[PDB]
Structures are given as C-alpha cells and as structure tokens.
C-alpha cells in the first residue's frame, strides 16, 4: 500500500525555569523509529524501532546535529513570536512543526507537507504545490515574506521530493519484515443494555496494523446518524492498534444491524451480525 | 532522515 515518513517537533518555553523543552519524533507510517527529548541524558537522537538501529554512527551524529539545529531555530522562534504577539516573558508558549513525504504503492512520491503552528493554532504552512505558503496571521505574513526571500519553499520541496522519499524507501526495505507486514483486525461484537427499551452495541477491531481502518455500522442501507459513535483509534502498546464503533438501538431488536470492517490486512471486508 | 537544508527561523 501507500507509505509516509513524518517528523513531529514540539518546543515549549519554560519562563525562568531553564531552557525550552524540545521534543522530536520520527515515523514511518504508524511506527516510531527515532526520538529526541531535550530533558533526557543522552542529548542524542535515539532509535526506537529495531531496523533504524542498523544505521552507522555517521547517521546518529548527523541526525543529532540537525535535530538540535531544529531546536535552536525554535528556541529563537519562541523569542520572535513572543514579540510579534506582545506576550509576556513569563508564561509558556508552544511551537510545533511537522513535515514529511507520502509515496504510493509503487514507492513513488505522492505529496509532501511542512506545517508550523504557534500556541496550537495554524501559523504558516507550505501549500501542496510546494511552491507557495499559507499564512492566516499577520505575523505569519512577516514570516511568509522572509522565507520567500530566503527560498525556503525551494529547499523544502527538494528534501520532500528527494531525501525524504529516498530514505523512506531505504527504511521500508530495512524494516521490511515489520513495516510492510500487515496485522489484520481481530473483530467481535458486544451488547450493553442501557434501558429496558434501549441497547448499545460496540463493534470491536483489535490487534491491527496499520492504523488506517474504517468501521461502518448499518441497518441494511444506513450509515452514521448523529448517533454513530466512532472513537479515536488508539495504540495497543505492542505496535498494533484498537478502535471501536458503537450504536444505540431503542430496538428491543438488535437486528439487523451490521458492522462492517475494512483493512489492508483483510483480503475481504468483514460483515458482523449480533449473537445470543 | 531529517532536513539538513530548509529550516529557517520565523
């Protein structure tokens, strides 16, 4: 199927109480492979999936250098933005950056992203053409123009089309036995009876990878109504994921509701009627 | 593999 590499950066200022806290993470699909935490011991980019460990010390020294340069730029950014928005030197603020490439089934470049956010709200973002910037805010107009004069987009475009996909492919090869392997959902139904008139049904999918799953309830030709309860997919802790999809039936008759489960791990979509 | 060329201060 399709794949991606994504890095996530977080910088939280710590007014008075030391230097900002900086956290960086890397993913291939829904598997983390690297991390950095400014408040751990190593002060090094650290491995997190087995197959990345295979890279030599040039890689570790390299990625440690760059990640720290990310951090340093964020550390400056927090001082910049505190100015832009007239905020006080006391009180915490947050910078977030995220970037990465997508490839299709043929392992070729589909799309790339580089977005940035200040105190949890969009700030500046590289458009999908990878030549243009989206800047809601006034302060982000300032940033837009500076980055435009700096040809930031031109550099990011390359990375995204080159380094980002090439190495995504290298990682998919090295972690082939796990990254390219699918774990199908183990599914089951359950029936919890709210009121003597009402019954709640939750459709379960367990032990699946990747995270991409769709769970559509039905009463023969029905979908989500402001009733369908579809919770966020969650980590099982072992590298697989879990998700459930509920529906309440004031029916004394749970029929004939169907749960429908779709995943790359199933050769055919599943249909699930209720039991006894 | 992280970005080596392309991160700028805002």
């Amino acid at each position, epitope marked *: 199927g399709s794949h991606s590499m994504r890095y996530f950066f977080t910088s939280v200022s710590r007014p008075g109480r030391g230097e900002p806290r900086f956290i960086a993470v890397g993913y291939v699909d829904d598997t983390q492979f690297v991390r950095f935490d400014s408040d751990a011991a190593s002060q090094r980019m650290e491995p997190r999936a087995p197959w990345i460990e295979q890279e030599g010390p040039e890689y570790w020294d*390299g990625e440690t250098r760059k990640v720290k340069a990310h951090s*340093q730029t964020h*550390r400056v950014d927090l001082g910049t933005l505190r100015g832009y928005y007239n905020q006080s030197e006391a009180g915490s603020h947050t910078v977030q950056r995220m970037y990465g490439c997508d490839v299709g089934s043929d392992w070729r470049f589909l799309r790339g992203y580089h977005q940035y956010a200040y105190d949890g709200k969009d700030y500046i973002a590289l458009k999908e053409d990878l030549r243009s910037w989206t800047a809601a805010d006034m302060a982000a107009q300032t940033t837009k123009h500076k980055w435009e004069a700096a040809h930031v987009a031109e*550099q990011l475009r390359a990375y995204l089309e*080159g380094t980002c996909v090439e190495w995504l492919r290298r990682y998919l090869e090295n972690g082939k036995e796990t990254l390219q392997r699918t774990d199908a959902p183990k599914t089951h139904m359950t029936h919890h009876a709210v009121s003597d008139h009402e019954a709640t049904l939750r459709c379960w999918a367990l032990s699946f990878y990747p995270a991409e799953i769709t769970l559509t309830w039905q009463r023969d030709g029905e979908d989500q109504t402001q009733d369908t309860e579809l919770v966020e997919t969650r980590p099982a802790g072992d590298g697989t994921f879990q998700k459930w999809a509920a529906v309440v039936v004031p029916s004394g008759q749970e029929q004939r509701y169907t749960c429908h489960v779709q995943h790359e791990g199933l050769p055919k979509p599943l249909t699930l009627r209720w039991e006894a | 593999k992280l*970005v*080596a*060329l*392309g991160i*700028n201060a805002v």
Partner: T-cell receptor
Amino acid sequence: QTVTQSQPEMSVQEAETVTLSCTYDTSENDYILFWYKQPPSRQMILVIRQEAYKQQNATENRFSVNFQKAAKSFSLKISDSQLGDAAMYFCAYGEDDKIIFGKGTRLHILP
Amino acid sequence: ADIYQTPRYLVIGTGKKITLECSQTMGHDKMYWYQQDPGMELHLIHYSYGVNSTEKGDLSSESTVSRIRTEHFPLTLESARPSHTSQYLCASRRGSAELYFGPGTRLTVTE
C-alpha cells in the same frame, strides 16, 4: 577536513583558463556549495553558489562550476583570466547550520 | 541596506579588553564570526541562529558575543593576547544560503 582544497597555490598566464579544485565530505544529501573570492582588500565576495538539488547551467558568468554530487566535487573554472582574478579563492559547504570553508587557494595571474 | 564592521583596524597590547562591532541592516537571522590568520584559513569561531542564540567554534578569547537588541553581533575578547592577532570576518546569511561578509577588522595585539 570537511572541505578540501588540495592546492594552496596556482598560477596562470593572462587570458588563459584555470580550474580550482574542491572536494568535500558529507553524509548528507541536502546542502549548498559556494565559491568565495578574497583579493588584497580582504573583502569576501561571493563568486558562485550551487545548491545540491540544482542541475546543469548557472554558471551564468565568465566563471563556471563542474558540480558532481556522487563525486562530491565542486570545481571552479575561470576562463580568459584577467589580472583582477588574482585573489584567494575559497570553497565552502553549507547546511541550516553551518557554513565551513576549505583551506583556500591563492591564485597568481602571470601577465 | 548592508553589513558593517567597526573598527577597520585596532592595536591594543596584551591583557587589555576589546570589542569588535558587527552590525547589519539586511534583516538576516543567521550571523557568523570567522577568524583569519596570516596563513589564511577561515575558522568558524562563533555563530547564531537569531536573537538569544550563540554558539562557539573555538579559539581563545572572544568566542560568544551577544545578540539581543537587533543583530548587531559584537565579538568581545576579554584579555587580549598576541594569539588574537588576525583578521576578524563577520558575515550575515540570507536564509540557509549565502553569506554576506563585512569588511573585516584587522587586529594586532602587541607586547
């Protein structure tokens, strides 16, 4: 070092062509390369600038470069040498940080 | 508008303390301080990502400067020594691309 200019000195007749050599060592694919001129004023001036994702051409002036990524080679070609090309020439490697320079080549131009 | 270095020349005598002004009005974030011996090598001695940011490269004396009220990136050698004798090249950077060097300060420390 990381950027290597293995000829500290070079000399050429007027009106002739010279190729100042540069190689570098990087475990990175994205970066930028530079040539910088420093005549007796000691004022550093950009000569040419090559990003790692660019292709042929540019070039642009009486100075060209022969950039070869796999070779990690970033040669500077100076043709129709004038006496004003007498100067130090530096080759340089750059990332988000840093930029570091090779040791440099002092160029004499024989009239 | 441009990048500036003052003073152009300075003579001091060992043990004394000295500050080299480098200022630049081009809006640039990254700035750098290179030190150049009579043997001509360019040594990265300090740099900076933007205000509050400082980092070293090496070389005794000056090697930290400051960067707050604009950039404005002053080098300071506390207690100068004949070792400090050299050119001091300050430079500003467009983005993560080329550099723009000030004229330089020629510093001689005398016994």
